[PDB]
Amino acid sequence: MVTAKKDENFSEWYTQAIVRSEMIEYYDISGCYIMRPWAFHIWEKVQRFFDDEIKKMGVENSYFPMFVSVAWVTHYGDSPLPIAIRPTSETIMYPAYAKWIRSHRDLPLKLNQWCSVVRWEFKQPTPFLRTREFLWQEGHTAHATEEEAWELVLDILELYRRWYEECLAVPVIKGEKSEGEKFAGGKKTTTVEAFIPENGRGIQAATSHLLGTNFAKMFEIEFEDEEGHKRLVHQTSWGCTTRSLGVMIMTHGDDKGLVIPPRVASVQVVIIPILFKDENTGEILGKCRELKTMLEKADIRVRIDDRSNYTPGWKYNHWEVKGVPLRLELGPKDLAKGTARVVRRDTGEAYQISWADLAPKLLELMEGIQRSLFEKAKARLHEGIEKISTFDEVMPALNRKHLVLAPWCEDPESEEQIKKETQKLSEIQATGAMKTLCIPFDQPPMPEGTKCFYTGKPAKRWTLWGRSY
Amino acid sequence: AMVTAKKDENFSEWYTQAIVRSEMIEYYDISGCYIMRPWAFHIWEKVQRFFDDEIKKMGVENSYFPMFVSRHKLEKPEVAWVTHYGDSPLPEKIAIRPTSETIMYPAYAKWIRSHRDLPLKLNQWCSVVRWEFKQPTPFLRTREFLWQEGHTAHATEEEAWELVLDILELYRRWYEECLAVPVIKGEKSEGEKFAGGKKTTTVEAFIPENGRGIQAATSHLLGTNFAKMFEIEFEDEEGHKRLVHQTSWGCTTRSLGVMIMTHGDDKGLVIPPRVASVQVVIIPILFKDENTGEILGKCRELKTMLEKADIRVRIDDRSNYTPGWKYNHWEVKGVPLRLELGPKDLAKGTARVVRRDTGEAYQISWADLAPKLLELMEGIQRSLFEKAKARLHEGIEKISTFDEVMPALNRKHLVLAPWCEDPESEEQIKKETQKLSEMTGAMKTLCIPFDQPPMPEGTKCFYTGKPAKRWTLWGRSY
Ligand SMILES: COc1cncc(-c2cc(F)cc(CNC(=O)c3cc(N4CC[C@@](C#N)(C5CC5)C4=O)cc(C)n3)c2)c1
Ligand SMILES: COc1cncc(-c2cc(F)cc(CNC(=O)c3cc(N4CC[C@@](C#N)(C5CC5)C4=O)cc(C)n3)c2)c1
Numbered sequence: 006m007v008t009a010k011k012d013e014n015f016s017e018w019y020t021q022a023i024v025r026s027e028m029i030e031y032y033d034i035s036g037c038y039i040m041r042p043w044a045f046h047i048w049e050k051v052q053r054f055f056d057d058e059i060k061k062m063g064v065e066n067s068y069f070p071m072f073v074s075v076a077w078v079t080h081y082g083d084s085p086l087p088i089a090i091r092p093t094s095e096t097i098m099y100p101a102y103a104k105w106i107r108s109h110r111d112l113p114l115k116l117n118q119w120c121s122v123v124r125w126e127f128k129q130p131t132p133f134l135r136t137r138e139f140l141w142q143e144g145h146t147a148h149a150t151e152e153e154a155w156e157l158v159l160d161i162l163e164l165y166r167r168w169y170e171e172c173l174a175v176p177v178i179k180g181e182k183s184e185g186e187k188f189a190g191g192k193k194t195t196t197v198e199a200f201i202p203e204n205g206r207g208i209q210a211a212t213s214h215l216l217g218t219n220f221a222k223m224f225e226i227e228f229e230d231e232e233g234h235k236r237l238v239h240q241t242s243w244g245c246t247t248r249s250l251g252v253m254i255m256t257h258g259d260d261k262g263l264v265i266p267p268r269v270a271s272v273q274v275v276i277i278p279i280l281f282k283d284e285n286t287g288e289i290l291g292k293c294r295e296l297k298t299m300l301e302k303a304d305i306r307v308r309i310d311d312r313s314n315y316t317p318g319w320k321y322n323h324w325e326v327k328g329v330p331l332r333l334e335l336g337p338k339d340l341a342k343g344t345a346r347v348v349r350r351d352t353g354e355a356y357q358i359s360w361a362d363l364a365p366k367l368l369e370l371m372e373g374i375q376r377s378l379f380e381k382a383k384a385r386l387h388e389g390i391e392k393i394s395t396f397d398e399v400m401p402a403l404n405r406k407h408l409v410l411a412p413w414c415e416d417p418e419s420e421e422q423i424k425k426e427t428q429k430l431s432e433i434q435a436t437g438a439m440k441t442l443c444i445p446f447d448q449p450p451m452p453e454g455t456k457c458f459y460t461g462k463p464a465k466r467w468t469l470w471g472r473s474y
Numbered sequence: 475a476m477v478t479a480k481k482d483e484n485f486s487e488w489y490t491q492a493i494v495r496s497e498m499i500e501y502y503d504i505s506g507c508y509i510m511r512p513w514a515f516h517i518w519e520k521v522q523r524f525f526d527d528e529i530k531k532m533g534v535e536n537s538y539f540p541m542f543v544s545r546h547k548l549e550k551p552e553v554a555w556v557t558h559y560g561d562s563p564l565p566e567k568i569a570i571r572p573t574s575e576t577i578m579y580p581a582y583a584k585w586i587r588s589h590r591d592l593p594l595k596l597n598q599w600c601s602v603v604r605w606e607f608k609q610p611t612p613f614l615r616t617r618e619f620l621w622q623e624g625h626t627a628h629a630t631e632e633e634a635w636e637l638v639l640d641i642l643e644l645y646r647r648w649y650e651e652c653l654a655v656p657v658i659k660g661e662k663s664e665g666e667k668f669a670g671g672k673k674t675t676t677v678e679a680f681i682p683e684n685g686r687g688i689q690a691a692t693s694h695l696l697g698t699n700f701a702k703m704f705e706i707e708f709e710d711e712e713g714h715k716r717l718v719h720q721t722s723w724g725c726t727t728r729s730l731g732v733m734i735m736t737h738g739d740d741k742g743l744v745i746p747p748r749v750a751s752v753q754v755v756i757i758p759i760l761f762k763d764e765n766t767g768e769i770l771g772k773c774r775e776l777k778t779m780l781e782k783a784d785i786r787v788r789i790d791d792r793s794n795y796t797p798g799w800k801y802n803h804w805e806v807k808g809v810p811l812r813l814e815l816g817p818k819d820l821a822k823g824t825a826r827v828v829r830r831d832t833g834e835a836y837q838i839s840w841a842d843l844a845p846k847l848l849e850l851m852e853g854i855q856r857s858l859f860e861k862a863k864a865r866l867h868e869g870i871e872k873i874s875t876f877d878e879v880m881p882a883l884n885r886k887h888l889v890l891a892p893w894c895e896d897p898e899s900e901e902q903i904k905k906e907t908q909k910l911s912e913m914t915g916a917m918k919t920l921c922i923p924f925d926q927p928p929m930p931e932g933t934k935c936f937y938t939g940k941p942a943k944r945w946t947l948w949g950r951s952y
């Protein structure tokens with residue numbers, strides 16, 4: 006049972022929740038975490054969704070080696086050798102792209118791979134959020150024109166919005182990264198950002214880069230034109246990781262533990278026979294089995310927790326901590342009345358449902374839960390953003406654990422200065438630096454001559470700032 | 475580009491040409507590692523979806539464990555050691571997984587307390603690293619490869635062994651039902667067994683052109699051995715602690731290599747319809763604007779019709795290539811069926827269909843296309859399998875004495891021979907066969923087949939002269 010309370014002791018709540026739900030297991034190498042089925046199934050679900058969608062775009066999967074020509078591999082079982090793990094595979098894939106692309110009809114080229122990457126940062130580790138090894142997908146495409154590459158950047162970003170909002174019920178904000186926060190060596194980075202109210206931090210949910218021609222020039226990825234001229238390809242890359250699971254956990258969880266959106270939950274309905282220690286005669290479990298078969302006919306994912314020793318209250322708490330969206334209780338009166346009691350995890354509301362009506366009503370409830378989780382989260386996102394005009398509004402907003410939307414001149418040195426000055430102010434108040442999250446695609450109007458909230462120069466666009474992961 | 479090496483003359487060069495010119499493989503600066511290009515990955519995804527669906531029906535759940543393993547857990551030459559980060563040594567070196575028993579089973583020891591926690595059935599899809607010094611072979615013997623490894627724990631041995639056999643049957647289906655590759659079920663010798671395990675079962679395949687057997691997949695009864703070393707125990711119903719009974723089982727991208735080698739021909743790849751991401755490629759014949767728009771439109775209608783019968787169709791309407799180039803391209807890639815549509819076909823209300831495996835052409839009315847192509851695809855799948863099965867049967871000589879061994883090996887055949895099953899004799903046979911051969915010429919056991927021929931009373935071991943125990947399949951091998 007989760008005993009830390011989410012808003013009072015958030016990091017402790019997160020650690021308790023992810024372990025007591027059986028999502029992760031600890032490991033004797035720092036920064037590495039076992040993904041148990043309760044978490045991994047969620048990965049399987051968003052992976053299937055995204056993979057189906059990119060295949061509709063003509064992206065095809067592949068596998069490139071994990072060794073880059075540095076985590077050095079010096080020996081093979083104490084036989085020394087005469088290596089380097091991928092943090093990301095641009096340098097692994099792009100020589101191959103230079104080889105594969107010769108003329109305009111070789112384009113576009115669109116590849117994806119699902120794999121794990123290793124990033125051995127010294128800083129402190131947190132499961133799903135920032136780890137030594139994590140799973141992701143990385144897509145890399147090359148196009149004859151910049152317009153086509155940018156169109157794909159935006160299509161992928163929309164797919165990421167759907168990954169978060171339709172699968173995980175997490176609202177995100179589409180936007181463009183500042184010059185200082187864009188991918189190294191690219192033209193323009195787009196992103197979807199999420200918000201964590203309990204610590205007021207923005208977090209990058211996924212990222213989709215217009216690399217432009219810089220990588221082509223560096224790796225000599227050229228193609229011959231239709232008129233016979235050598236031209237550089239225009240490239241993109243885009244990635245999204247198991248950090249999505251962390252965001253989902255933080256968005257929907259409450260004081261009792263996780264809440265898993267029905268669309269991705271490994272079990273959608275747990276059937277809990279109200280049986281005590283020697284009560285097994287087959288009457289309750291039989292109807293439990295019948296109900297499982299019926300519900301599975303409607304493509305509902307069901308488990309019966311028929312484990313001998315635990316009380317019904319133990320099982321209720323166990324499955325609430327895991328965050329299964331619906332619980333179906335079947336005990337003796339239920340059996341004698343022909344009904345079952347269903348409790349939905351997000352609100353605790355209970356329904357007495359006739360056995361005939363179970364599969365429809367549950368489908369209904371699941372849609373309700375999934376929509377409600379999104380709408381409540383979207384409302385919290387909206388209540389977490391203060392639209393300001395001047396710098397004196399910044400520190401107050403940050404102390405309410407909010408982000409700010411402010412008019413900005415988009416000068417990069419100004420972003421560095423704002424980082425340093427908000428860090429300074431935070432230490433004197435006693436990680437406190439505030440930085441840009443994105444420049445949202447949805448731009449409110451910019452009245453003529455609006456001043457940048459920090460520099461006083463002419464503002465160019467509304468920019469989203471906050472403390473960050 | 476097209477294949478020009480002949481499969482029955484320079485087999486190695488033929489294989490290299492077939493995997494490169496079909497766009498399956500790309501070479502890499504780090505020896506023993508290859509890029510797996512999309513055309514190969516499509517086949518991998520087909521067999522992966524099949525096997526994953528089937529183990530999900532058994533209650534196995536997917537998971538993901540770390541790629542790194544500590545020195546103590548690993549050792550409770552193949553193994554790659556991360557020893558430095560930059561110029562600095564790590565305080566303690568850590569290893570990249572060659573296999574995950576030592577990574578998963580400490581967690582198993584912690585998760586299993588009661589008979590109510592069993593069975594525990596997990597799988598993961600990942601890659602592993604076995605860094606041998608010798609010459610690699612794309613797909614078949616590589617330093618990094620993709621696989622699935624399944625790991626289960628049970629309250630009884632009988633239950634674990636049932637699961638071992640059920641997984642082995644899934645591997646038979648993977649090879650024979652999906653890839654159309656015949657395999658032989660059997661049990662490994664004591665010396666070829668998984669180290670630490672109790673009993674290893676296997677499906678073995680055969681490569682006729684070089685005479686070599688190769689393990690296609692493997693399913694181990696670990697028994698209680700690993701439960702002992704990792705202290706994986708459960709309380710039964712009367713409060714007594716018992717060790718669990720364990721299995722582990724794996725299958726890799728080697729299967730793609732075996733498929734290639736089995737069905738490929740002088741024109742290159744031949745993909746069995748069941749694992750072809752493109753079963754039918756439609757090639758519109760456009761020459762000097764003879765009815766361009768109408769031909770393209772009819773191609774799209776035919777694709778929709780075929781898709782409704784679940785046929786996997788691609789229209790190659792790419793402009794910058796000729797029809798003849800498209801023929802060669804999709805041939806070397808092994809697409810099972812090519813459909814051609816031109817002005818003549820447009821008028822007659824028909825299409826011309828060429829099957830990759832034999833080259834036989836058919837003229838088919840549009841209304842008949844779907845049932846006829848479903849039939850042809852079933853026929854191609856079954857024919858690939860049956861021809862390979864005959865080649866496998868012709869590549870095994872049943873013998874009784876050692877003096878028949880070297881002739882049979884020189885015919886590039888395997889031998890099925892009665893054997894006493896003492897391990898010393900397997901080492902002795904290996905050494906003598908190698909010496910007589912004069913890339914290894916040695917002969918080792920491939921498996922003791924489940925399907926045992928009769929053992930007449932008093933049959934002698936082909937090598938020691940002691941009483942034979944069972945028929946054992948031997949050969950040169952990968
Ligand atoms: C940022 O300052 C830090 C502060 N405090 C601690 C750390 C830290 C500590 C460690 F011990 C180990 C690590 C290494 N892991 C990662 O860097 C990382 C990055 C991402 N990322 C980065 C952005 C991205 C998106 N969208 C990219 C597309 C991929 C996405 O998901 C996801 C995960 C799970 N892990 C970081 C780092
Ligand atoms: C035997 O002396 C040799 C002679 N000549 C060359 C080598 C060699 C050279 C290398 F450069 C790299 C390697 C390492 N790769 C592998 O050993 C290997 C094993 C398997 N295996 C082993 C059995 C199994 C089955 N079924 C198990 C389920 C897993 C299955 O698929 C699959 C693959 C793709 N690679 C070996 C070794």
Ligand code: PRO
Nearest residue numbers: 093143212242243244
């Ligand atoms: O690390 C990144 O952000 C880019 C996009 C995915 C692969 N590399």
Ligand code: PRO
Nearest residue numbers: 573623692722723724
């Ligand atoms: O390497 C092997 O043979 C076993 C089976 C898969 C996991 N370990």
Ligand SMILES: [Cl-]
Nearest residue numbers: 015016019131
């Ligand atoms: Cl946290």
